[PDB]
Amino acid sequence: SGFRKMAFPSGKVEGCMVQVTCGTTTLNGLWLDDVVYCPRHVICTSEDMLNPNYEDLLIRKSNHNFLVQAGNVQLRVIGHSMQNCVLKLKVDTANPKTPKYKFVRIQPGQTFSVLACYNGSPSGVYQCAMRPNFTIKGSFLNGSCGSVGFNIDYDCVSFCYMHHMELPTGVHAGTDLEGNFYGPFVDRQTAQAAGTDTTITVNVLAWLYAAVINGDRWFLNRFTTTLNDFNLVAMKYNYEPLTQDHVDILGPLSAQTGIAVLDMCASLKELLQNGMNGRTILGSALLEDEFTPFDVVRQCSGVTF
Amino acid sequence: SGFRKMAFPSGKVEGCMVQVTCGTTTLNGLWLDDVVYCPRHVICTSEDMLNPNYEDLLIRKSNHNFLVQAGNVQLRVIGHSMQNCVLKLKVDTANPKTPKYKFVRIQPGQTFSVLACYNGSPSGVYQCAMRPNFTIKGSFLNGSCGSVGFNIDYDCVSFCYMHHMELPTGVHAGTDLEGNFYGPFVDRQTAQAAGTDTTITVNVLAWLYAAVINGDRWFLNRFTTTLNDFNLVAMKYNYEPLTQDHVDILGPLSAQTGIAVLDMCASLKELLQNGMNGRTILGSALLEDEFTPFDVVRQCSGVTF
Numbered sequence: 266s267g268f269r270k271m272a273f274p275s276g277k278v279e280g281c282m283v284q285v286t287c288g289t290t291t292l293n294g295l296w297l298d299d300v301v302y303c304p305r306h307v308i309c310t311s312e313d314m315l316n317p318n319y320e321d322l323l324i325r326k327s328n329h330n331f332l333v334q335a336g337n338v339q340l341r342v343i344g345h346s347m348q349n350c351v352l353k354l355k356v357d358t359a360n361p362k363t364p365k366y367k368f369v370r371i372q373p374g375q376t377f378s379v380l381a382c383y384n385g386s387p388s389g390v391y392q393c394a395m396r397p398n399f400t401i402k403g404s405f406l407n408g409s410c411g412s413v414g415f416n417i418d419y420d421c422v423s424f425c426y427m428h429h430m431e432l433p434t435g436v437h438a439g440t441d442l443e444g445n446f447y448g449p450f451v452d453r454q455t456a457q458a459a460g461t462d463t464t465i466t467v468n469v470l471a472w473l474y475a476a477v478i479n480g481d482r483w484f485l486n487r488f489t490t491t492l493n494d495f496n497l498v499a500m501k502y503n504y505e506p507l508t509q510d511h512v513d514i515l516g517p518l519s520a521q522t523g524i525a526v527l528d529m530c531a532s533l534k535e536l537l538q539n540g541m542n543g544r545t546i547l548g549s550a551l552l553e554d555e556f557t558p559f560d561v562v563r564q565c566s567g568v569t570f
Numbered sequence: 571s572g573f574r575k576m577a578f579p580s581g582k583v584e585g586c587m588v589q590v591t592c593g594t595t596t597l598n599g600l601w602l603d604d605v606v607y608c609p610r611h612v613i614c615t616s617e618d619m620l621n622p623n624y625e626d627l628l629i630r631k632s633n634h635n636f637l638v639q640a641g642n643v644q645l646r647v648i649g650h651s652m653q654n655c656v657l658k659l660k661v662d663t664a665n666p667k668t669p670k671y672k673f674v675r676i677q678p679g680q681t682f683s684v685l686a687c688y689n690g691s692p693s694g695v696y697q698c699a700m701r702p703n704f705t706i707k708g709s710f711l712n713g714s715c716g717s718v719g720f721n722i723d724y725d726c727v728s729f730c731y732m733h734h735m736e737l738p739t740g741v742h743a744g745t746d747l748e749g750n751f752y753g754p755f756v757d758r759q760t761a762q763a764a765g766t767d768t769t770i771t772v773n774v775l776a777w778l779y780a781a782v783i784n785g786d787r788w789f790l791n792r793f794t795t796t797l798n799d800f801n802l803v804a805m806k807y808n809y810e811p812l813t814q815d816h817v818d819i820l821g822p823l824s825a826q827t828g829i830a831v832l833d834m835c836a837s838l839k840e841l842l843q844n845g846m847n848g849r850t851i852l853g854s855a856l857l858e859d860e861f862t863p864f865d866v867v868r869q870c871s872g873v874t875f
């Protein structure tokens with residue numbers, strides 16, 4: 266019993282974190298096999314950040330301009346290349362702690378663990394979700410760039426995020442491990458803002474199924490809804506539209522609890538109208554949207570209470 | 571910016587988790603040097619759990635009755651002894667991944683990271699606090715016994731909790747690594763219940779300082795109060811008494827924000843007496859009490875391990 270925002274064990278990722286320095290700039294790098302991956306803005310000074318010409322800044326660099334430190338050992342850089350907004354530093358030593366891994370690009374609503382790092386040294390681990398506006402609500406200070414997001418389903422590490430920046434509202438933006446940003450963001454210190462965010466409807470529904478699995482049914486009702494009527498109401502509360510794909514994805518949780526997806530949708534409609542009236546759901550007074558259908562199945566028992 | 575329930579990086583602990591099996595019972599063990607630590611109820615059958623005589627159950631066992639598995643390698647047990655509610659299995663191999671460590675007993679209100687394990691294999695990491703009633707609000711299924719709680723200071727892992735059981739309300743109970751239970755609990759399947767819980771006042775105040783650091787000040791007011799007047803207010807809402815020690819501990823956060831502790835107490839008095847009035851603090855509609863003053867400072871400073 267119980268339900269917590271749970272992160273994956275971070276050990277396989279801690280063994281890959283290194284420190285990357287280029288002149289006066291220091292950030293984190295991910296060391297996999299004989300390559301260190303890091304944000305390309307490590308080659309920028311504070312002046313360069315407004316309109317950097319990365320191709321022109323990079324051509325002026327040699328391998329010895331990059332200092333890579335793995336623990337207390339200096340790694341030797343023997344090559345460098347840029348791929349989108351990521352810098353790839355070829356080093357002379359393959360990481361003996363390289364786990365089994367893949368690079369995956371996630372969609373909004375998907376969750377992942379973040380290993381926050383400073384100076385190549387891990388400080389903490391927390392669970393996150395890619396928001397519908399492609400930002401993440403992380404906890405990051407200066408020096409955290411290069412920190413990564415990941416999932417570890419089975420023994421394989423799927424790296425999905427590399428941290429690049431913090432926006433004026435305090436939320437975070439970054440890229441996949443191929444250097445493609447999530448969202449319409451650029452690695453420039455220019456006027457950038459997160460678009461209006463929305464609630465991840467399929468995740469709130471999944472978390473309502475988790476509450477039912479843990480023995481809480483006070484929020485259920487005798488009503489149902491059509492998918493379109495649910496969306497017409499939900500969007501009035503800034504909730505993302507629920508698609509037929511989301512309904513299919515909720516199938517297993519619907520069968521485990523005996524509650525049809527459109528029946529749980531009616532309960533969500535009523536919760537939005539009434540609030541909780543002094544009650545909580547899984548220890549929360551708000552409707553939680555950072556647990557996916559897959560996360561609930563992963564954490565909860567297969568036997569409903 | 572940002573504020574998340576953050577756990578310590580779990581790598582140093584993952585390298586110590588093993589599977590312990592005695593007959594038909596399987597749970598997790600902590601392998602440090604040449605000793606495996608696990609709950610003593612691993613020697614019990616379902617019938618024994620009702621009224622076990624552990625010294626008598628243990629005397630009937632030999633070393634080969636215990637199967638210890640570290641990954642896919644079987645460890646050989648060469649000795650066994652009991653210390654309170656923990657079983658200590660002497661093995662023929664010292665753990666080469668043994669980190670620098672200490673066994674520490676924590677007080678209610680203190681937080682720690684939990685590495686949830688099943689069959690000696692880590693599945694997740696989350697943060698929680700030792701409640702004033704000595705239970706923890708964890709997330710644990712069958713097979714999780716032997717999972718451990720810990721903190722990290724530099725390179726030293728301080729093990730503070732070993733998981734033993736789930737109470738009927740879904741909350742959890744366990745021991746320190748010396749086998750002494752936290753709370754008035756016993757390791758048998760008898761009528762046991764969590765006592766009435768209270769809110770950790772010093773932690774709520776710390777989290778209010780974290781909200782101010784992150785730019786949220788709506789709850790601030792011109793008023794102040796005394797420790798004596800605020801403690802009458804705290805007693806009425808099932809909040810733990812605030813002591814002069816708690817006030818001294820909040821000193822650094824008070825100086826960083828410019829808000830006196832009794833001044834922040836006047837804000838909490840008003841939040842308790844009137845609620846949030848539709849507003850949230852750090853994305854929560856409830857007053858959060860599972861962040862200590864030290865957790866707030868560590869997360870708002872970037873301390874690494």
Ligand SMILES: CNC(=O)CN1C(=O)c2ccc(Cl)cc2[C@H](C(=O)Nc2cncc3cc(S(C)(=O)=O)ccc23)[C@H]1C
Pocket residue numbers: 306314405406407408409410429430431432433437451452453454455571
């Ligand atoms: C908030 N940003 C800044 O003050 C300046 N700034 C940028 O705007 C920027 C733009 C594009 C890129 Cl690719 C990189 C950056 C950097 C950036 O955003 N780095 C950070 C990342 N994560 C977390 C942070 C947190 C902080 S804070 C405000 O908590 O001290 C401060 C910088 C943090 C720097 C140069």
Ligand SMILES: CNC(=O)CN1C(=O)c2ccc(Cl)cc2[C@H](C(=O)Nc2cncc3cc(S(C)(=O)=O)ccc23)[C@H]1C
Pocket residue numbers: 266566611619710711712713714715734735736737756757758759760
């Ligand atoms: C809820 N437990 C039970 O029904 C029976 N029960 C005990 O009462 C007990 C008493 C003293 C000790 Cl030292 C040990 C236990 C065990 C225990 O509590 N083990 C578990 C630990 N953590 C989490 C769990 C979660 C579950 S569940 C409800 O998710 O299936 C099921 C057992 C979980 C077992 C035998």
Ligand SMILES: [Cl-]
Pocket residue numbers: 370371372375
């Ligand atoms: Cl995805």
